[PDB]
Design a binder for this molecule. Structure first.
Ligand SMILES: [Sr+2]
Ligand SMILES: [Sr+2]
Ligand SMILES: [Sr+2]
Ligand SMILES: [Sr+2]
Ligand SMILES: [Sr+2]
Ligand SMILES: [Sr+2]
Ligand SMILES: [Sr+2]
Ligand SMILES: [Sr+2]
Ligand SMILES: [Sr+2]
Ligand SMILES: [Sr+2]
Ligand SMILES: [Sr+2]
Ligand SMILES: [Sr+2]
Ligand SMILES: [Sr+2]
Ligand SMILES: [Sr+2]
Ligand SMILES: [Sr+2]
Ligand SMILES: [Sr+2]
Ligand SMILES: [Sr+2]
Ligand SMILES: [Sr+2]
Ligand SMILES: [Sr+2]
Ligand SMILES: [Sr+2]
Ligand SMILES: [Sr+2]
Ligand SMILES: [Sr+2]
Ligand SMILES: [Sr+2]
Ligand SMILES: [Sr+2]
Ligand SMILES: [Sr+2]
Ligand SMILES: [Sr+2]
Ligand SMILES: [Sr+2]
Ligand SMILES: [Sr+2]
Ligand SMILES: [Sr+2]
Ligand SMILES: [Sr+2]
Ligand SMILES: [Sr+2]
Ligand SMILES: [Sr+2]
Ligand SMILES: [Sr+2]
Ligand SMILES: [Sr+2]
Ligand SMILES: [Sr+2]
Ligand SMILES: [Sr+2]
Length: 81
RNA sequence: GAGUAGUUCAGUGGUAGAACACCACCUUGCCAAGGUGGGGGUCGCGGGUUCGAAUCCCGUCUCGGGCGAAAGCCC
RNA sequence: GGGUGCGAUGAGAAGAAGAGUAUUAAGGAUUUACUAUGAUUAGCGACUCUAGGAUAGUGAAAGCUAGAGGAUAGUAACCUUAAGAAGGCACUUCGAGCACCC
């Protein structure tokens, strides 16, 4: 969802970033873009799978990272509550 | 008057020079830079002159320019 | 504040390599190449010798081409010592602006 990423306090941007923060385990939820290359998106849902955290799925990796504040759009972004 | 190496330029009768680019090694993470080495040229083309022609001479092609009624002519 | 180019497919910083390398110096060492020079006097023009070429004049010997052989330095290649770097991609954390222009 985009209201929830717009939302909140502590969020996480870029995919190397979600992945690194995934092995920390202090993320509450993680949201990802379907238009993205599945080469990377693979690598965020495998372990957001294994861990147990809810994964949701996005249309465009572009309005995602307008939601984030960035003026560029992101392929993976995590709300680390 | 312009014409010479990929390009930009020199070269004012003694076999064609520089930069830059291209090749090779340095140099296996991949480049760039660098430092060495090497390659490459009917001097637009054909004559003539000369021991020798990028050089001077005549013809010829292209291109700029100018004189001209043109044909032509000059740089 | 304006105009562009790029950025979570990673802006930008730092670390880490790079590397005790390239290299500048002080030596050591005396072979390989690279280049530079070859008394005077003729001569525009000469390290020596060989073969071809080709030769008008000057010359003891001439400009091309292909080889081979000589000393003087200057060089880069091997050693020692003291000094000795660096830009980008890629690595490694932090993670959003950086670059050109008025
Ligand atoms: Sr921006
Ligand atoms: Sr030309
Ligand atoms: Sr000229
Ligand atoms: Sr190479
Ligand atoms: Sr180079
Ligand atoms: Sr060279
Ligand atoms: Sr050369
Ligand atoms: Sr050369
Ligand atoms: Sr050719
Ligand atoms: Sr001829
Ligand atoms: Sr002749
Ligand atoms: Sr001729
Ligand atoms: Sr004319
Ligand atoms: Sr007229
Ligand atoms: Sr992109
Ligand atoms: Sr960077
Ligand atoms: Sr750095
Ligand atoms: Sr360093
Ligand atoms: Sr490194
Ligand atoms: Sr290395
Ligand atoms: Sr070290
Ligand atoms: Sr004298
Ligand atoms: Sr003399
Ligand atoms: Sr002399
Ligand atoms: Sr000789
Ligand atoms: Sr011989
Ligand atoms: Sr002979
Ligand atoms: Sr004679
Ligand atoms: Sr003679
Ligand atoms: Sr020779
Ligand atoms: Sr010497
Ligand atoms: Sr050394
Ligand atoms: Sr790589
Ligand atoms: Sr800078
Ligand atoms: Sr102004
Ligand atoms: Sr102004």
């Amino acid at each position: 969802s985009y209201d929830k990423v717009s939302q909140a306090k502590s969020i996480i941007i870029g995919t190397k970033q979600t992945v690194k923060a995934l092995k920390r385990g202090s993320v509450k939820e993680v949201v990802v873009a379907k238009d993205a290359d599945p080469i990377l998106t693979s690598s965020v849902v495998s372990l957001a799978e294994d861990q147990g955290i809810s994964v949701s799925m996005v249309e465009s990796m572009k309005k995602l990272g307008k939601a984030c504040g960035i003026e560029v759009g992101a392929a993976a972004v995590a709300i680390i509550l």
